Amino acid sequence: AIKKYKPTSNGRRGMTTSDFAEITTDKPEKSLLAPLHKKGGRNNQGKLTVRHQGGGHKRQYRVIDFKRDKDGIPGRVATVEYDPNRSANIALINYADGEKRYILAPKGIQVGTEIMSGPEADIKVGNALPLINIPVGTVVHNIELKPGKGGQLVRSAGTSAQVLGKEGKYVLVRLNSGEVRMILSACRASIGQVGNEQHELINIGKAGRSRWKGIRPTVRGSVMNPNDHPHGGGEGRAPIGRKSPMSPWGKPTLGFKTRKKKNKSDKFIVRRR
Amino acid sequence: MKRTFQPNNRKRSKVHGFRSRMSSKNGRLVLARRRRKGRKVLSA
Amino acid sequence: KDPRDVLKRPVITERSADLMTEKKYTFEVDVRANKTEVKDAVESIFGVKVDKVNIMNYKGKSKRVGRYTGMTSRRRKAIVKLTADSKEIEI
RNA sequence: GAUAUUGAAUGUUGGUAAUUGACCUUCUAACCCGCCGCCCUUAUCGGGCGGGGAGACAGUGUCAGGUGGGCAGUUUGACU
RNA sequence: UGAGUAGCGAAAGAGGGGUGAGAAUCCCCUCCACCGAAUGCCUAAGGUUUCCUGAGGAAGGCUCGUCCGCUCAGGGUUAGUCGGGACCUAAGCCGAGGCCGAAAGGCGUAGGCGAUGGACAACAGGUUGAUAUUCCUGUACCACCUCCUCACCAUUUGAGCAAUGGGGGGACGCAGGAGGAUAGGGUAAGCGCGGUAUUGGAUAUCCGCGUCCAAGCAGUUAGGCUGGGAAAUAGGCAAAUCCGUUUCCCAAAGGCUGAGCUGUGAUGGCGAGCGCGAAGUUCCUGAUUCCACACUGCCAAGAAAAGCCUCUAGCGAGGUGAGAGGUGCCCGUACCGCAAACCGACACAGGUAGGCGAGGAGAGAAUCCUAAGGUGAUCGAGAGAACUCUCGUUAAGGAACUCGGCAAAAUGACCCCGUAACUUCGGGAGAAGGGGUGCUCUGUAGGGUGCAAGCCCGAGAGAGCCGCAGUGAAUAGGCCCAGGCGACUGUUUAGCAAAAACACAGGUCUCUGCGAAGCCGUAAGGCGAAGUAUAGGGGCUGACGCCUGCCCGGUG
RNA sequence: UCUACCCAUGUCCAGGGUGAAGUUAAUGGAGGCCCGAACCCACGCACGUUGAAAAGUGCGGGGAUGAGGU
Ligand SMILES: [K+]
Ligand SMILES: [K+]
Ligand SMILES: [K+]
Ligand SMILES: [K+]
Ligand SMILES: [K+]
Ligand SMILES: [K+]
Ligand SMILES: [K+]
Ligand SMILES: [Mg+2]
Ligand SMILES: [Mg+2]
Ligand SMILES: [Mg+2]
Ligand SMILES: [Mg+2]
Ligand SMILES: [Mg+2]
Ligand SMILES: [Mg+2]
Ligand SMILES: [Mg+2]
Ligand SMILES: [Mg+2]
Ligand SMILES: [Mg+2]
Ligand SMILES: [Mg+2]
Ligand SMILES: [Mg+2]
Ligand SMILES: [Mg+2]
Ligand SMILES: [Mg+2]
Ligand SMILES: [Mg+2]
Ligand SMILES: [Mg+2]
Ligand SMILES: [Mg+2]
Ligand SMILES: [Mg+2]
Ligand SMILES: [Mg+2]
Ligand SMILES: [Mg+2]
Ligand SMILES: [Mg+2]
Ligand SMILES: [Mg+2]
Ligand SMILES: [Mg+2]
Ligand SMILES: [Mg+2]
Ligand SMILES: [Mg+2]
Ligand SMILES: [Mg+2]
Ligand SMILES: [Mg+2]
Ligand SMILES: [Mg+2]
Ligand SMILES: [Mg+2]
Ligand SMILES: [Mg+2]
Ligand SMILES: [Mg+2]
Ligand SMILES: [Mg+2]
Ligand SMILES: [Mg+2]
Ligand SMILES: [Mg+2]
Ligand SMILES: [Mg+2]
Ligand SMILES: [Mg+2]
Ligand SMILES: [Mg+2]
Ligand SMILES: [Mg+2]
Ligand SMILES: [Mg+2]
Ligand SMILES: [Mg+2]
Ligand SMILES: [Mg+2]
Ligand SMILES: [Mg+2]
Ligand SMILES: [Mg+2]
Ligand SMILES: [Mg+2]
Ligand SMILES: [Mg+2]
Ligand SMILES: [Mg+2]
């Protein structure tokens, strides 16, 4: 549920939060953590290549099992946990052999739920099968693009995709965006919608809360100078004053499609979003 | 008022020192020029 | 190395004279010499029993004779305490 | 877009006397893989080997057209 | 030349004595004054001998100079334990092969380097002109070694050692509150030592000063977390008697840790005071420190690696434990360090991380005056004009001033009463507006601490007293009505603009199916993201509320 | 070595007030919350303008648990 704060100050006015009712423990699994330093949107040259990224809270990386490749061994859901590195919650799985792993927490998973990977697994929320084994109409998440690589698509909080049909070697899947696409049938997908569906409703409330999440301010092009941005300059406020709205680097940025026109995956994409 | 020169021997040596100069072609040209001019001090 | 390369010369000061009453002998030593080498050198040369060697480095002093500035040599000074039951060194 | 890297088949439709074109589909063996396993090897680099995916496409070279204040060099008269 | 002109850089000195060729300026003494959450003490960076002693007075010192951070001599820095290295890793940097690139080179794997972090054994007192967890005294601890001593275990299921491997651990945020404790404080009581005053009074509930103590070792403790045992085991690159998991069996124990306290250390040391040396207890108060990120709460979800422990894999004829004897390197250590020694060209009203930071009254690190301790400021002497500056006061009037109440004045603390429009129901609000506030006696009610005397804290009254005035000084909101703009806290033109500009939460459009788009780079390699459409980039708008019409010809 | 932003790792912030959620009027202790030192800033005025200072000083001023300072 979304908790709404009372307006005890102007900062707090309209601010909302997760109640974190799903989260069953505060402490992560020490063995599945890795270090994760901030980059500030700087690349290997030390240069800022993405704007508006920097600062925010320190975070440890939780190693998530996107592959879901322990076929046959049953796994008990031990915890549902906050992960700072992603919108979804994660679930610690205790496998019967004593291996521990994190997965993405699906909607309506519970502590003590048994889960199973592989072609022989049941079609139940938390399980992970090859798409050849998943029946048509099944809501899935954490979809592989290449066999064995790990789930890449449909991982964010509340997101879901649907298996539409099997074309032998490929399976049709409606992705979360609404795009319909051929996925190799050997690729795995996890059963269910991703949990933490309310995430999108959160009203961040104040500037400082965006800063905690590592988002530095966006300055509009219109209030820069001509040497900085195509929209810069003009005496007083100015309209766009150009044929198209423009990016900082002088490309059209409203409607202009940027997917590469010769793309190898074009054949796999059946219906665009 | 905080002025521009804030001395620090580590930073002096790391930025301007002999090993820094020797670590690049252009730094080696600095040393070659200063030797050619006949400087007492080649580097920090 | 030779023992007599380690010990350069005795320090003859009021301080060093006061130390000799306490059975401590001050030497200028080779700048590279560690205090174990100094201990071994004193025992070899003088035939005494060393309790401990304390050692210190002195920087070169800036100096002038007219216009020409320059530095004195850096020095390594060893204060060699002999044991209670030991022969004294003859300076 | 042409052409090189660039191969093999099956169709179909040109043009010359059975060869050579054009295009469609298929193939695998070049090429590619920011996919998996194994080894070099204590290695999220690289390379090798074996799967898988893709495939004569892509990528890259040469040539060509379009777009292109993103950037560059400049011009923007004189009388008064 | 200007000109013997401007200036001589925030500040309290006065006299006596001394030295000397010479003294406002150097030394000594006395009293006075200044700082005292510092102008004290410690210690970074930085400086590099400026430190100490003796001698000096050309220059430097805004004057002088016998003096000095200056000149000349000579001297001074002592470590197994402090800080750094012979330990560990972060960001980043370097980078065998490697990838990429006209050349130069760029990138990057293994592997390293790299503290601002992790780890890690010594304390108290004394001493020099100048060093001191470094020297000395006393009492310790850590690692390693074996000519030795003693005990115990064992020579192929055979002690023991044990990985560069596995596992555990290390290992982490922010806020809040309550405990426990200790520094520190009060001198309350007791104790000790000294004093009894000549200015009216006082063996007085009189005056002054002092009133302790380490690491280590042994014991103990507020407590803190932790559930443990036994089998079996698709996992932990091999193996595991370890870890993980499961199932049974007990729910108090066991672990792991603990500030501090007590004994000892100490037949010692320190100690008012006069080399000698008294008392050296208790009570009260009490942290911003420690127990301890322990607990509780919260979302923004809070390094790594080693030391350490354990496990096997290995290694093994001698081991293990205790004693005794022994070994323990290099670098720094002077001095300045809110400053005349560093950064500002200066002996410059500026800047300079961190630790400690006492008392009275106090909520306090505010404020004023003081303590410990430090200091009197590097031109002076007069005169007391204009004018300028910084202050204080001002008849009557009270914004008439002025672009504008600019400046100044006023308000100011605590307690009690009372408090509007409007509102997003939080606010507005310390709204506004009133009243009280000292001292004495009753003398407290009550509370904390203690076994109790006692010691702190302490309303609310009643009756009195004094002044022009009682938060009698210093320090402590002026307030209200209405309107434009921007919702808000933030941000900005270092050095003429702080704003209505930027940002912002929210809104919307758009791109982006992941080798994503976008971006940096010739490329390799990267950022995006160890993210995956509830995500990421770009444009515009800018809380919230009500809303956001018409036009697709032109341009995109 | 100034400054802009970022990265890793430390550290600093006297005191007082208000009283969100939650819990059972009390309890609780939220906040780019309030008042206010240190610290950071630089709104007004004066002075300074061959300065004590190539941006300061004095008296007032803003922030002061945060989008914080260092
Ligand atoms: K808000
Ligand atoms: K903006
Ligand atoms: K403009
Ligand atoms: K003060
Ligand atoms: K002198
Ligand atoms: K020293
Ligand atoms: K602005
Ligand atoms: Mg952005
Ligand atoms: Mg502008
Ligand atoms: Mg432009
Ligand atoms: Mg424009
Ligand atoms: Mg206009
Ligand atoms: Mg030493
Ligand atoms: Mg142009
Ligand atoms: Mg030209
Ligand atoms: Mg003309
Ligand atoms: Mg004309
Ligand atoms: Mg005259
Ligand atoms: Mg004149
Ligand atoms: Mg005159
Ligand atoms: Mg004058
Ligand atoms: Mg002066
Ligand atoms: Mg005073
Ligand atoms: Mg001196
Ligand atoms: Mg003079
Ligand atoms: Mg150390
Ligand atoms: Mg490199
Ligand atoms: Mg090489
Ligand atoms: Mg360090
Ligand atoms: Mg230590
Ligand atoms: Mg000293
Ligand atoms: Mg010292
Ligand atoms: Mg100064
Ligand atoms: Mg008090
Ligand atoms: Mg005080
Ligand atoms: Mg008047
Ligand atoms: Mg009057
Ligand atoms: Mg008027
Ligand atoms: Mg007028
Ligand atoms: Mg005013
Ligand atoms: Mg504003
Ligand atoms: Mg300005
Ligand atoms: Mg201004
Ligand atoms: Mg690329
Ligand atoms: Mg990446
Ligand atoms: Mg706008
Ligand atoms: Mg419109
Ligand atoms: Mg049209
Ligand atoms: Mg605030
Ligand atoms: Mg400061
Ligand atoms: Mg500023
Ligand atoms: Mg304030």
XYZ file of C-alpha atoms in Angstrom, chain C residues 1-90:
90
model
C 81.935 -4.544 5.427
C 84.690 -3.296 7.752
C 83.624 -2.269 11.322
C 85.801 0.862 11.003
C 83.798 1.989 7.934
C 80.665 2.063 10.159
C 82.059 4.330 12.914
C 83.348 7.607 11.419
C 84.349 9.632 14.495
C 83.332 10.348 18.149
C 81.040 13.287 18.953
C 82.894 15.499 21.470
C 80.320 17.924 22.935
C 79.105 18.936 26.413
C 76.045 16.696 25.847
C 78.236 13.753 24.759
C 80.564 14.335 27.756
C 77.506 14.177 30.065
C 76.439 10.909 28.363
C 79.892 9.348 29.025
C 79.224 9.586 32.807
C 76.103 7.431 32.166
C 78.306 4.987 30.140
C 76.910 6.169 26.778
C 79.216 6.949 23.841
C 78.153 9.176 20.937
C 79.501 8.398 17.450
C 79.000 9.828 13.998
C 78.329 6.706 11.899
C 77.938 5.960 8.188
C 74.613 7.410 6.983
C 73.635 3.947 5.602
C 74.535 2.048 8.829
C 71.648 0.503 10.801
C 71.866 0.308 14.610
C 72.641 -3.455 14.516
C 75.738 -2.741 12.367
C 76.731 0.021 14.832
C 76.275 -2.375 17.782
C 78.422 -5.032 16.042
C 81.062 -2.439 15.021
C 81.521 -1.089 18.576
C 81.788 -4.616 20.054
C 84.303 -5.625 17.337
C 86.575 -2.560 17.590
C 86.571 -1.635 21.292
C 85.879 -5.110 22.773
C 82.953 -3.903 24.923
C 79.429 -5.170 25.673
C 76.657 -2.962 24.235
C 73.317 -2.720 26.075
C 71.555 -0.785 23.291
C 72.147 1.645 20.418
C 69.847 4.629 19.930
C 70.309 6.307 16.554
C 69.183 9.555 14.910
C 69.564 11.378 11.586
C 70.576 15.041 11.355
C 69.784 17.058 8.223
C 72.499 19.165 6.606
C 72.598 22.745 7.944
C 72.312 25.641 5.482
C 75.563 27.643 5.583
C 77.209 30.742 4.045
C 80.752 31.991 3.396
C 80.201 35.354 1.681
C 77.874 35.162 -1.350
C 77.967 31.361 -1.785
C 75.170 29.491 0.030
C 75.293 25.720 0.585
C 74.650 22.769 2.924
C 76.751 20.866 5.462
C 76.709 17.048 5.190
C 73.841 15.100 6.759
C 74.920 13.108 9.827
C 73.888 9.877 11.532
C 74.553 9.976 15.289
C 74.530 6.768 17.381
C 74.331 6.866 21.204
C 75.819 3.530 22.333
C 74.941 2.461 25.901
C 77.368 -0.147 27.288
C 76.199 -2.757 29.818
C 76.843 -2.294 33.554
C 79.466 -5.078 33.633
C 81.551 -3.841 30.675
C 84.923 -2.214 29.971
C 84.824 1.532 29.208
C 85.880 2.886 25.793
C 89.042 5.063 25.814
